[PDB]
Design a protein around this ligand. Sequence first.
Ligand code: HEM
Ligand code: HEM
Ligand SMILES: CNCCN(C)c1cncc(CCc2cc(C)cc(N)n2)c1
Ligand SMILES: CNCCN(C)c1cncc(CCc2cc(C)cc(N)n2)c1
Ligand SMILES: C[C@H](O)[C@H](O)[C@H]1CNc2nc(N)[nH]c(=O)c2N1
Ligand SMILES: C[C@H](O)[C@H](O)[C@H]1CNc2nc(N)[nH]c(=O)c2N1
Ligand SMILES: [Zn+2]
Lengths: 404, 405
Amino acid sequence: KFPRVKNWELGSITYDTLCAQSQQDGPCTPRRCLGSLVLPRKPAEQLLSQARDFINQYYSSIKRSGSQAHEERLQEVEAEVASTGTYHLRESELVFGAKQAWRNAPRCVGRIQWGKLQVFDARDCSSAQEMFTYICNHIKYATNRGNLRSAITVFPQRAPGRGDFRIWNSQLVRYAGYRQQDGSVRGDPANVEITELCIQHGWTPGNGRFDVLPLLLQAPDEAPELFVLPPELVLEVPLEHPTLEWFAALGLRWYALPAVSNMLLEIGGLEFSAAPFSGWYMSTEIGTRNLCDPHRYNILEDVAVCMDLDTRTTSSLWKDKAAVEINLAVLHSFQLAKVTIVDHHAATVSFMKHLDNEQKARGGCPADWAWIVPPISGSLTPVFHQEMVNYILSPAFRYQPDPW
Amino acid sequence: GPKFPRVKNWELGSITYDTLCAQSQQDGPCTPRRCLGSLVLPRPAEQLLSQARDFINQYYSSIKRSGSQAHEERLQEVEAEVASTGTYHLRESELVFGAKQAWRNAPRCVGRIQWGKLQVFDARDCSSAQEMFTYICNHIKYATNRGNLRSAITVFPQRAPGRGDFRIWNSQLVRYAGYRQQDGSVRGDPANVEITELCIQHGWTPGNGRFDVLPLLLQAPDEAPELFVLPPELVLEVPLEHPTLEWFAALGLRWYALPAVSNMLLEIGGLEFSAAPFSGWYMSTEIGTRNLCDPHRYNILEDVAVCMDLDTRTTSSLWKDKAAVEINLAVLHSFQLAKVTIVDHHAATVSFMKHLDNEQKARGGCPADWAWIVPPISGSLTPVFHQEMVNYILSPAFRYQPDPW
Ligand code: HEM
Ligand code: HEM
Ligand SMILES: CNCCN(C)c1cncc(CCc2cc(C)cc(N)n2)c1
Ligand SMILES: CNCCN(C)c1cncc(CCc2cc(C)cc(N)n2)c1
Ligand SMILES: C[C@H](O)[C@H](O)[C@H]1CNc2nc(N)[nH]c(=O)c2N1
Ligand SMILES: C[C@H](O)[C@H](O)[C@H]1CNc2nc(N)[nH]c(=O)c2N1
Ligand SMILES: [Zn+2]
């Protein structure tokens, strides 16, 4: 049985058949749905089968499926697993695998872009120092003077005999969070733990709200090392508002490059524990979540007071009013600085086009509705009205435990 | 540790475990292979007895008499009744318990903090379509209460073997007509096109406004549905104005005070009440965001944004978000002015979090549909956005049922 998927705005119905290609179970059972949970509660034969399936995927994608190059390649993989317990990917295969991982990421609204991804092979990396070099080039390439380009750098895969290559930071750019004795937090509350780990490993702390953290980089079975990014590498956008002169006074800012550095990339059963990837922001990530979440910078009441709003009652919708001006500020400021950004309406409309492309290409598209629908103005966007099917395809980005 | 779903709040960092889901007997649409949680509508003899036995156990527990002699005698009384007739009857207070528990169990309802405060009108004696009309008018009168809205449900006779159903054809007691135009467009509410055409086929003389109140199509057992027009003074409405945008009132928008769902099935202990309309009060985003701004409903966003003189030629001006906010404010302001009960999406979600905490202590969980609980605007500004939820089906329940035609 294949899920029947309906759009409630248009009346149109599709059938997801791609989900039958899922080999990995999610958190739901027929007794109870667990789709709103953020994290999971969580053999040569099995590695070999994921390898076969992936190699078949690759040769099918270049329409050389069944051919001699294909046959001989499966033989290589099988021969290599049989005597070493593992294998290695060709650069071309890794490029394919990385693009598919993005394509398959059900929580990502930006997947219209999935075929345009620059892949840096960093598998010849043997130290934190080289990782840092690779990371710096990635940032320079990706940022491209505000003309953002999507990229991934892939460090050496996990191996049975040793500890992982890891980037301890959750993103390549993070603002420090400084825990106060008086309970509160200066800077980004989301980054208290990593800030403290940086200090413990000997970083000289700042005292600002927007102090860019150093990277903690780890080569196998070694203590992590500390590397400060050259400030000229981290593009930042001061936030002002198009018609509210006082907004700029607030001294708000955000960095240009969203670069996730703590997820695991799995391809054909191989696991890449350090494989930082980046694109460009959707404005609501900065304007709504990072700046307005109560457990983040939490600036809503501040902005509302400057707007002289009735802060004393919920029914004046001050929160809603302030959040809209904040999101507008982010868009205006990024556009003024010529740094790539996408608003949530433009993003969700392109995501609808992606669904349509994928329906035609693959018979469906794994999508996590709760993460696709923006944090403000949900039903004002087309994705709100679109039913979606969530499931796990490989290659995939996965979460993994923090390495401390 | 515990072998039940771990549930996390990401704002507060706090953890619970849902043990109540263990009580679920009916399977939802998901499997380990794929999550179908965002689908609005996914695809008796011994059976009856087990559902019946379970409900009576629920009832006696609610009154703290499990295992008692009255408990076992009621169980005996029920199976005796099923053995000789195939069905059975609820005592009055069982029906009252069941109706409240059905609301309490409703995963898509954010208003469940009020669940214990429900007026239950017993209408299981009703025997004509004219009589259904009297019960409905009475319900509307009681529930509207001149703007001081009171939750209520009226329960009509249960499905009976052989005999036909009591059905209310309309999806709500109050519904604006949707008139399909020559040019293909719709005047009024596009959601109500079919029911409008059904009323007409059954002899209603149609109007031509954006806000014409539909007559009721009420159906008694094995009879064609009869048509009934509500006395306009029984249908309380609120004209919409804005607290500072003076032109907003000139738009001629309005909404009715009483949201009363009339097409759902109430199931208790295997017994099915095919007509059992229930009503509460509105959360403002239902009117202001969904009914007025959905592209496939009234679709007024562009009208308002033009009046607000916003740049509607580019998404990045956030004209849609700006207009939606003011439309929601107008709804809240106009209901407040008219002294008609309403709740904003902030107050409502805050009260739902309190409800989740009450239920965690009372029952060890609360079935909840995250996509439906989180409001259609300002999602992450409300605390439920940061709350993981477990969705599952408990009974008593309100269920969807096929349209009777
Ligand atoms: C090009 C512009 C892109 C945009 C606008 C975009 C947008 C987004 C957004 C809004 C989210 C939700 C994030 C959150 O709320 O925490 C997300 C998640 C995600 N994105 Fe994209 N993305 C882009 C590029 C990429 C690229 C290049 C990759 C990988 C190569 C990627 C992979 C992912 C993954 C794996 C997630 C899920 C993260 C998680 O589960 O925490 N995205 N994206
Ligand atoms: C007292 C104030 C109440 C409020 C603010 C409230 C709020 C809501 C809201 C906002 C929804 C979402 C509906 C949609 O978006 O289509 C909903 C659904 C629902 N409500 Fe409540 N409600 C209230 C009272 C009641 C009562 C008295 C009952 C029954 C006794 C009830 C039962 C339900 C059920 C069964 C649904 C699911 C409807 C569906 O799945 O289509 N509610 N409610
Ligand atoms: C669920 N735990 C981790 C959350 N996480 C990895 C995360 C948190 N906050 C923000 C992001 C940014 C995600 C992202 C990635 C890319 C490539 C582009 C973009 N605009 N956003 C990710
Ligand atoms: C999704 N299928 C059913 C449609 N449906 C029942 C529905 C649609 N649109 C709006 C409502 C209103 C739901 C409701 C019910 C009650 C008692 C109170 C309230 N505030 N809202 C219901
Ligand atoms: C509990 C809930 O699932 C959680 O708050 C989710 C909701 N949807 C989200 N959507 C996005 N894009 N990012 C998020 O962090 C979240 N958080
Ligand atoms: C596809 C999606 O499930 C559908 O549009 C849902 C989303 N959440 C909703 N939430 C509520 N309260 N009411 C709705 O009608 C919907 N529609
Ligand atoms: Zn699910």
